[model samples]
Target: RVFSLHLGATRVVYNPASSGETLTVINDQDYPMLVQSEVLSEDQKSPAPFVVTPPLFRLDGQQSSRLRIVRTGGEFPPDRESLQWICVKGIPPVSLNVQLSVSSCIKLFVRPPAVKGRPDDVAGKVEWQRAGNRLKGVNPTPFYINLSTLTVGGKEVKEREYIAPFSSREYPLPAGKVQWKVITDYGGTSKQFEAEL
Candidate 1:
């Protein structure tokens, strides 16, 4: 029943050196909504290390609320970045008789103080290798590399992938010039990067 509720940003970044991060939830509909926010681990079964303030509250129409995310107690890898999910659910009043509810889940990146480098630099840091028909991408940086619009031999691969920090991923591709773009921190696409096979 909640018609229009959106997040200010498509992704959130948490720097351990800072106090915390703030998320803005805006209710754009004319009716009020019961908003609930929480942080969950990537697997969702385990609890996350962060806490959100004002987890449950009533957000009036055309109003916005700021949620604070603070790290609780958990030891993450100091050399690489950790990923989590922040879910915001908007619940309508029971009197509305509507069962539909809207929820927004966005990526939450916890960047350790020891991870030195900007997240935007991750695209260029990825190493590419070709093994037979499989194309392997290795992310040696502390940030995650979101890849899209992949093409091999001037043909679209119709595949999208993300390489985790210090991890690698393989895609089925033939020998050719590999071209793709990465998703930046602000949810924007980066310039095309090409690697010849």
Candidate 2:
């Protein structure tokens, strides 16, 4: 498939009392397409607070469309930041004779204002717990913790993973030095920390 597109931004940081957010997507492909947008919870399993407009529309080649996302004016935790994913999907135009069409998705992030510390502060507050060969990370802060890689002793233990706010998650390891990297919001990451258990 030769479908190409461009999105105005990769993420949105929303503050309360604001009107809403807008996204502009340009279709660079030669064929027309059907576009749709939705807001998904951080779990990627359910709908979130935001609403998407023009959920379905047709776009001509080289044309652009604007998607409006508005929050429901609901109350979220004041001390914690809410995370959501905005999915913009595109399905190429189909013909009666060749009626098969596949859909592609573009994922964007939404970050609501937090009442507490920054996102990078989460990794510093994490507590590492181990049970047998399994490793677990407990996040006490309100922000989400994005782990890039974990190394035990001198060897990498696990790949990238996420620890939700005020919760604990399990990871696999052989037991030993556990150094971890925290991914920052600005596309960079913190330096590896000293082994903690």
Candidate 3:
């Protein structure tokens, strides 16, 4: 899934050409089930007012999915355009945007690193609360934030929602640790894992 997210090239005096960043939103729900999805609205309530998009999917007992989007409405590179994603049976419908500041690698993908994957199989991305607002890009931590809502034990809970530190910086995960837990907008939160070296 390619998106309009991208960055402008930096030159000594002038600016280099800009490249649109592609964000492939993936599917990572429970194993093998029918899936369907849509975009969400602001106020974190109804769908966007004039949003015109399509429903994304991956059926036939698959456990994941993906869709690409871009950002092409700014006078600068890496401008953020409002958007959202709602995956059925996965994370609650939530809000997000495409990053305009381009980076060589800014994909929030899923899939357990192979050496353990199935024949002809790949990875998947998990859904979450406040949008993927943690840290993006494949840095030392190879990390990013995934936002969504969850219903564990019949209780609903929102996920990560802070503009603290991260989104384009190198994060060295604590020794022997990959994922970490982050607090959400509603006080509670979820888990985030560390990437492999």
Candidate 4:
């Protein structure tokens, strides 16, 4: 009925005719906010008809970010940040690899996203931890991870936005690409619809 957050892009298009594997969500600012995928329409009171909420995804504020959610598979819908993005069912502890290369520096940022699965589960969704290991980067400095990253995980695509100066928080990704994915490590058993984006 309504879009909780407004998108900043020319248009969010997906080609039913195209065979490409990646799903695209254009970003105008190159730093778009990953708001709740499905919110009460500004005026409408009821949500969408389907109970299943898609995964969360937002494009860059400047350009667009085409997200490759799956390595290979049938054409599924793009993970919409406007829906209720949930953590992969059965995934106990999840970690996202934010690999950074600065001049000659490498950093691994393990954290959460901005939004989360639900209003109540926000606190429990944050899975960032400080492991005392000599990997790289300034050890004393801590990383700020969002609570939503853990709920619905995504892979960091390295072609554009991901490559940058670690000191600067903003990574610019081009249009037609997703900066990350929503992976759930459902160790045992088969969980098909846990994530439908």
By summed lDDT, the worst window of 10 consecutive residues in model 2 runs over 100-109
> lDDT of each prediction vs. the true structure?
0.81, 0.69, 0.27, 0.24
> Each model's TM-score?
0.89, 0.74, 0.25, 0.19
Model 3, residue 151: what's the lDDT? Answer: 33
Q: Find the candidate with the highest lDDT and give its number.
A: 1
lDDT of 2: 0.69
Instruction: Please identify model 1 stretches exceeding 4 Å from their true place.
Output: 94-96, 174-176
Candidate 4, position 121, lDDT: 26
What's the CA error at residue 96 for candidate 3, in Å? Answer: 38
Question: RMSD for each model, in Å, please?
Answer: 2.5, 3.7, 17.5, 21.9
- The better candidate by TM-score, 2 or 3, is 2
Task: Judging by TM-score against the true structure, name the best candidate.
Answer: 1
Clashing pairs in 1: none
Ranking by lDDT: 1, 2, 3, 4
> Residue 153's C-alpha lDDT in candidate 3?
28
Give the candidate order by descending TM-score: 1, 2, 3, 4
lDDT, model 1? 0.81
Error of model 3, residue 123, in angstroms: 30
